[PDB]
């Protein structure tokens, strides 16, 4: 479908694994907000100022209808499970790297299905929790997902970074490498 | 690998020329298989998959559901576009463009929206031979970045130039490399 | 406020 702007006013997700779910609004491929279903809390991702408001109850009851329909469809398919795809990982910086100028490392994991994955960063082969953040599962036209993880790092000549993703389609924790070419 | 049964629902709105041509497609998906679809240009539910046949046949029988979905293109799509017209569609951030070799690369980073055309110049004449360009990289934080490389034969060359144009730029950006 | 699309329940 061709259009000037495409929005997903309700990417609703519910899976039996956790069990877990996800509710986000997307406009032109980017995430406007998500709803923390466990905390019953709307978390906005707009890069602007806005007085907008969205009641998190809509997500909770919408996902409830998804759970209702999922159980009945797991039954009507003689239990057909989701087949695990192989994620495609790519690491790159947000800005050109300058020594000593704080930057952001981006780890794009694409073609995710089912929507379940651990994404962690390693620095010099050791784990790092400070300065890491990620997006929700963003939707794709083939109904898979992609996730993007961010690592705020200070470029130096001694720090080495890897992106470690783990998915059932992998059968081996993938590590994508990146070095600061100044 | 433990078994997982997913379910997806996507109320996708398509806008062309402001709100002239607006189209809603609500997709109900079992795993990665869209089973039922409400196409606003069709007017009613249409099963895409055997699984969706009993779901579509039922929803189509309920008059109240049909009236809600036929009006969702206005109640949801066109309504949200009005507040989209005041927020994200106003977002214009200028790209930061630098030049460095590895082959000459022009790094255009952190710009919104996505529509961007960049050109390479050699000495004033647009070098178009061997200008491999990269896809549009979505950073996921409401910014984009794009890299453009050029097969440069630099011997006795003088001043390469990267020239980018963007909806946030009143006058286009020009950065050179002597 | 942003409105959102609603998924319909199927017959059990």
């Amino acid at each position: 479908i061709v259009a000037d702007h495409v929005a997903s006013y309700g990417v609703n997700l519910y899976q039996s694994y956790g069990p877990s779910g996800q509710f986000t609004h997307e406009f032109d491929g980017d995430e406007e907000f998500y709803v923390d279903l466990e905390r019953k809390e709307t978390v906005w991702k707009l890069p602007l100022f806005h007085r907008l408001r969205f009641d998190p109850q809509f997500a909770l009851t919408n996902i409830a209808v998804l759970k209702h329909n999922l159980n009945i469809l797991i039954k009507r398919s003689n239990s057909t499970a989701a087949t695990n795809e192989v994620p495609e990982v790519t690491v790159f910086s947000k800005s050109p790297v300058t020594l000593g100028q704080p930057n952001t490392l981006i780890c794009l994991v694409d073609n995710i299905f089912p929507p379940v994955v651990n994404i962690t960063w390693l620095s010099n082969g050791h784990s790092v929790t400070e300065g890491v953040s990620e997006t929700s599962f963003l939707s794709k036209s083939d109904h898979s997902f992609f996730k993007i993880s961010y690592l705020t790092f200070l470029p130096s000549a001694d720090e080495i970074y890897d992106c470690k993703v783990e998915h059932w389609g992998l059968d081996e924790p993938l590590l994508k490498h990146w070095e600061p070419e100044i | 690998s433990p078994e997982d049964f997913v379910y997806q629902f996507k109320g996708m709105c398509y806008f062309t020329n402001g709100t002239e041509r607006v189209r809603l497609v609500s997709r109900s998906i079992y795993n990665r298989e869209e089973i039922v679809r409400f196409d606003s240009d069709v007017g009613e539910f249409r099963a895409v998959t055997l699984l969706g046949l009993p779901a579509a046949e039922y929803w189509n029988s309920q008059k109240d559901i049909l009236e809600r979905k036929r009006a969702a293109v206005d109640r949801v799509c066109r309504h949200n576009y009005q507040l989209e017209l005041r927020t994200t569609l106003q977002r214009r951030v200028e790209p930061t463009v630098t030049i460095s070799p590895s082959l000459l690369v022009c790094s255009v980073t952190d710009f919104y929206p996505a529509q961007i055309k960049v050109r390479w110049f050699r000495n004033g004449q647009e070098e178009t031979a061997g200008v491999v360009s990269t896809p549009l990289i979505r950073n996921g934080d409401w910014t984009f970045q794009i890299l453009v490389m050029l097969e440069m034969t630099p011997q006795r060359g003088d001043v390469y130039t990267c020239h980018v144009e963007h909806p946030s730029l009143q006058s286009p950006i020009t950065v050179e490399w002597r | 406020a942003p409105f959102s699309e609603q998924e319909q329940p199927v017959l059990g």
Partner: antibody, heavy 107, light 111 residues
């Protein structure tokens, strides 16, 4: 349709009452209204499933409601004010999940 | 609130033409309702229009959702004595679509 209980209730001036309501099976939204004598229904509270969505017009000094499991609801008033003499309506609606937003009222 | 009704009681003869004005204000694309409350009964839904130019009709009552005038006037060609009731104009408002009712219009049809 929606079931309400009781149909009539007499209570003393400084006393407590509890109104029970069972919505149409599967309806998300549930309202409690107040209709005083010859007037229109004044909205008190609206439930989504089990979560309160609107309670701007609910006098928390004595009025309180709950819909724990997201099906039946109970509205309580304590203490009572002689101004509370009215008909307390309960209504339910699919809220867009399974049907329209129209509300179906009880007795 | 956001729905203004024909304030005041109405009295008509056994075959007169009934017209109850109702206008809305809210931005966006709301649904419009008409609820009837017969004397000694609960509130029934009379008719409703979900979107633009849709006309709800029931029991000989008609109401056209008119965007050009932000109106939804209730009409009936030949009223009847059994039509004596209170008629409420309603439109759901807010992000959650809460059904809020107007003041209502009392109608007594004399024979």
């Amino acid at each position: 349709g929606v079931a309400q209980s009781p149909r009539y209730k007499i209570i003393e001036k400084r006393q407590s009452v509890a109104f029970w309501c069972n919505p149409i099976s599967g309806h998300a939204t549930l309202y409690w209204y107040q209709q005083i004598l010859g007037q229109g229904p004044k909205l008190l509270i609206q439930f989504q499933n089990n979560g309160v969505v609107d309670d701007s017009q609910l006098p928390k000094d004595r009025f309180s409601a709950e819909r724990l499991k997201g099906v039946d609801s109970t509205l309580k008033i304590q203490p009572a004010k002689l101004e509370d003499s009215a008909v307390y309506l309960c209504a339910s609606s699919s809220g867009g999940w399974g049907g329209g937003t129209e509300a179906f009222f009880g007795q | 609130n956001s729905v203004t009704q024909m304030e005041g009681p109405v009295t008509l003869s056994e075959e007169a033409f009934l017209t109850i004005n109702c206008t809305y204000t809210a931005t966006g694309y709301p649904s419009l309702f008409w609820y009837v409350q017969y004397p000694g009964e609960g509130l029934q839904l009379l008719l409703k229009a979900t979107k633009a130019d849709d006309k709800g009709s029931n029991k000989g009552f008609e109401a056209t959702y008119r965007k050009e005038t932000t109106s939804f006037h209730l009409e009936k060609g030949s009223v009847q004595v059994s039509d004596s009731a209170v008629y409420f104009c309603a439109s759901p408002q807010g992000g959650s679509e809460k059904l809020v009712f107007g003041k209502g219009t009392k109608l007594t049809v004399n024979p």
